[PDB]
Amino acid sequence: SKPFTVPILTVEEMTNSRFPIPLEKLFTGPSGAFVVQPQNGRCTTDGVLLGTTQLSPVNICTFRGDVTHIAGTHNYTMNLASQNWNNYDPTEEIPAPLGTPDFVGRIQGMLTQTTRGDGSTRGHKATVSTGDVHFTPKLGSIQFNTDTNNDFETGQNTKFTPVGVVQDAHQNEPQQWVLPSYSGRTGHNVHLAPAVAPTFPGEQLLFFRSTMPGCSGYPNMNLDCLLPQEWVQHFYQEAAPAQSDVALLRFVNPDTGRVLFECKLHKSGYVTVAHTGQHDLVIPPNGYFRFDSWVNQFYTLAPM
Amino acid sequence: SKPFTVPILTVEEMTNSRFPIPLEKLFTGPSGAFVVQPQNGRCTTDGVLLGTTQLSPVNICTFRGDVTHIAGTHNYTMNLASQNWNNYDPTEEIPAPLGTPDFVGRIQGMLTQTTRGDGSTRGHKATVSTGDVHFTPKLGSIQFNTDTNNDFETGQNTKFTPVGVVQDGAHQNEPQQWVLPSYSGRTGHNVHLAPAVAPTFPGEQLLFFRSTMPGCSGYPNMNLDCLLPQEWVQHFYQEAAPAQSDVALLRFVNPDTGRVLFECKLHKSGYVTVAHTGQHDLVIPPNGYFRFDSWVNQFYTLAPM
Numbered sequence: 302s303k304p305f306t307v308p309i310l311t312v313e314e315m316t317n318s319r320f321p322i323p324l325e326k327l328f329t330g331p332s333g334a335f336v337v338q339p340q341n342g343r344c345t346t347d348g349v350l351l352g353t354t355q356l357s358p359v360n361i362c363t364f365r366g367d368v369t370h371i372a373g374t375h376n377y378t379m380n381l382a383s384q385n386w387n388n389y390d391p392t393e394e395i396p397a398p399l400g401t402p403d404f405v406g407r408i409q410g411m412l413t414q415t416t417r418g419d420g421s422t423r424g425h426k427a428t429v430s431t432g433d434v435h436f437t438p439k440l441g442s443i444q445f446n447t448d449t450n451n452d453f454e455t456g457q458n459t460k461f462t463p464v465g466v467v468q469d470a471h472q473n474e475p476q477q478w479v480l481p482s483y484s485g486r487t488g489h490n491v492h493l494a495p496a497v498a499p500t501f502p503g504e505q506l507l508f509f510r511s512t513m514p515g516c517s518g519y520p521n522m523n524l525d526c527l528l529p530q531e532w533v534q535h536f537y538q539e540a541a542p543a544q545s546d547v548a549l550l551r552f553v554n555p556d557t558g559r560v561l562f563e564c565k566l567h568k569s570g571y572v573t574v575a576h577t578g579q580h581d582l583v584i585p586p587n588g589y590f591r592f593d594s595w596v597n598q599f600y601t602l603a604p605m
Numbered sequence: 606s607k608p609f610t611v612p613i614l615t616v617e618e619m620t621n622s623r624f625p626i627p628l629e630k631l632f633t634g635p636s637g638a639f640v641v642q643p644q645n646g647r648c649t650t651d652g653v654l655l656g657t658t659q660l661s662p663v664n665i666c667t668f669r670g671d672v673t674h675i676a677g678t679h680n681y682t683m684n685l686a687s688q689n690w691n692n693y694d695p696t697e698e699i700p701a702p703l704g705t706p707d708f709v710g711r712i713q714g715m716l717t718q719t720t721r722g723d724g725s726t727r728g729h730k731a732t733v734s735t736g737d738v739h740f741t742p743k744l745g746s747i748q749f750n751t752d753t754n755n756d757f758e759t760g761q762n763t764k765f766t767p768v769g770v771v772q773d774g775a776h777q778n779e780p781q782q783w784v785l786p787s788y789s790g791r792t793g794h795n796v797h798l799a800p801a802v803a804p805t806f807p808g809e810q811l812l813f814f815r816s817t818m819p820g821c822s823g824y825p826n827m828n829l830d831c832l833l834p835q836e837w838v839q840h841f842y843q844e845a846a847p848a849q850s851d852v853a854l855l856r857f858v859n860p861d862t863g864r865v866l867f868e869c870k871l872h873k874s875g876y877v878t879v880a881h882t883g884q885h886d887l888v889i890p891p892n893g894y895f896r897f898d899s900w901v902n903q904f905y906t907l908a909p910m
């Protein structure tokens with residue numbers, strides 16, 4: 302039976318699975334005051350993708366499709382295509398197109414477009430507000446606010462590349478743990494990856510944390526994912542069968558050979574540590590995770 | 606001795622190692638008429654990174670540092686930090702900071718900045734022209750043209766996120782993906798490059814992993830070919846499997862029929878060749894993937910592609 306493994310990449314060598322930016326650090330904190338239900342970076346240890354999770358680190362929070370100008374505004378409606386430009390299908394049993402942002406906030410980036418005939422191209426700063434009434438990606442359309450009211454053409458391939466977040470009380474947006482309504486006010490979310498929470502006394506989620514670029518105002522730029530994108534890619538390929546519900550990982554300093562801490566990688570795809578309170582883990586930059594064994598549901602971790 | 610493998614990700618499931626975008630297809634063509642010497646997406650099969658290649662798919666063509674306004678213009682000088690905000694050391698024997706663009710062209714994206722003190726933020730459209738005299742990343746500084754003349758502060762962490770390429774003149778004449786920038790500008794010559802690559806077996810051509818860069822203005826050449834998917838770079842770096850010869854034979858397989866579409870040579874020094882003459886967009890099943898089959902000697906003749 303094929304042995305389970307995690308990548309030996311260090312934290313700084315890996316990518317956030319909820320936004321296309323590098324991981325910076327490990328963070329643990331209490332999460333009782335909210336619902337932890339991200340839809341990107343969701344994958345089982347035996348390699349089944351969940352929620353809106355797809356395999357590309359650079360297609361996260363991107364959109365593709367065609368655009369139509371909204372008269373008398375600087376806004377454009379995008380009718381979504383799939384990430385490979387064929388028709389988008391709302392009957393596929395996912396919450397939204399794969400890689401759709403999984404938090405409420407205003408994401409700024411650029412809309413770019415190519416005219417098929419002559420290869421002319423154009424690019425404009427654009428912002429999508431995932432909390433607004435027009436954010437209905439599951440229905441196949443979303444709205445952008447842009448810096449132009451006339452440059453974009455109809456019936457031409459258009460891409461949104463995310464860059465960062467904006468805010469207009471400080472750090473009151475984005476809300477990284479609030480899911481958008483993928484069908485807007487017209488419906489409720491469907492086929493979600495489940496909420497996650499520690500269930501063992503003294504345990505907290507371990508988050509893989511990045512700082513999103515801010516493009517305006519005073520945004521909350523903290524972004525926590527449950528699994529590095531490289532781990533999603535790894536499990537997807539390996540598809541190693543899980544021999545219990547909990548994989549024991551040791552975080553190791555490869556120079557000293559010493560274990561810094563141990564943690565539980567849950568089969569359904571998230572990590573817990575034995576700690577209480579908010580804490581930025583102190584780790585050597587060469588540190589990495591090592592799978593050591595499958596353990597039962599009642600395994601007591603050495604305290605972090 | 607640890608068995609060599611390549612990832613089983615399909616072409617469309619992988620990332621270009623020369624720009625932060627998905628792979629779209631496989632392309633082969635003659636390359637005798639130019640120098641194929643990209644510096645990103647360069648890695649040996651036993652996992653040694655070469656040129657400016659680093660591990661992050663999202664740090665390719667990104668820059669980090671602090672900026673200074675150039676008075677009376679919309680331009681800024683960036684003093685480069687390393688990708689983890691450490692000092693960049695120009696005496697390090699690499700061509701340029703890891704992830705530096707390895708083509709001459711105008712790259713458009715956004716410059717973003719956070720004021721440490723109060724967490725105030727700002728973001729502006731910006732372009733870096735890697736062929737310009739002020740593009741000297743090996744010296745630790747580059748220049749951006751931006752949409753602002755006053756918003757960016759000094760002494761604050763500033764990041765450039767690449768989006769696409771622009772062209773300014775003859776159509777599709779820029780960027781020039783096979784022309785390396787002069788990393789030290791007019792002040793010095795490029796050093797410590799990953800070697801130029803070329804087929805050395807009769808009837809062989811390089812196999813390219815191809816993407817289409819977003820275009821942001823004008824009529825750019827948006828074709829971007831890399832020698833290795835970023836996921837292969839990551840895979841070899843981790844595995845560090847010893848090469849048992851200079852050439853690994855790969856078969857590209859249709860996992861449904863189990864049938865081989867073509868075979869190719871993955872050279873130990875990190876690039877792929879196929880037996881074909883002429884420009885050709887490979888036609889492949891979307892679920893097709895590469896499979897390492899054996900190390901072969903220097904005299905192995907590939908089946909025609």
Ligand SMILES: C[C@@H]1O[C@@H](O[C@@H]2[C@@H](O[C@H]3O[C@H](CO)[C@H](O)[C@H](O)[C@H]3O)[C@@H](O)[C@@H](CO)O[C@@H]2O)[C@@H](O)[C@H](O)[C@@H]1O
Pocket residue numbers: 516517518519725726727728753756
């Ligand atoms: C906190 C503040 O965020 C950003 O400023 C925006 C404003 O952006 C506009 O004005 C600013 C400064 O006046 C700047 O000229 C920018 O190019 C321009 O778009 C504006 O959107 C208001 C809304 O009324 O919100 C903020 O004040 C940023 O530019 C600043 O540097 C600063 O971080």
Ligand SMILES: C[C@@H]1O[C@@H](O[C@@H]2[C@@H](O[C@H]3O[C@H](CO)[C@H](O)[C@H](O)[C@H]3O)[C@@H](O)[C@@H](CO)O[C@@H]2O)[C@@H](O)[C@H](O)[C@@H]1O
Pocket residue numbers: 421422423424449452821822823824
């Ligand atoms: C081929 C052309 O490329 C882009 O236009 C640019 C120009 O961009 C400027 O003008 C356009 C109006 O066409 C637009 O207002 C844009 O915001 C502005 O920056 C300009 O850079 C010239 C240089 O002289 O080159 C191109 O004409 C694109 O916007 C067009 O749609 C078209 O594809």
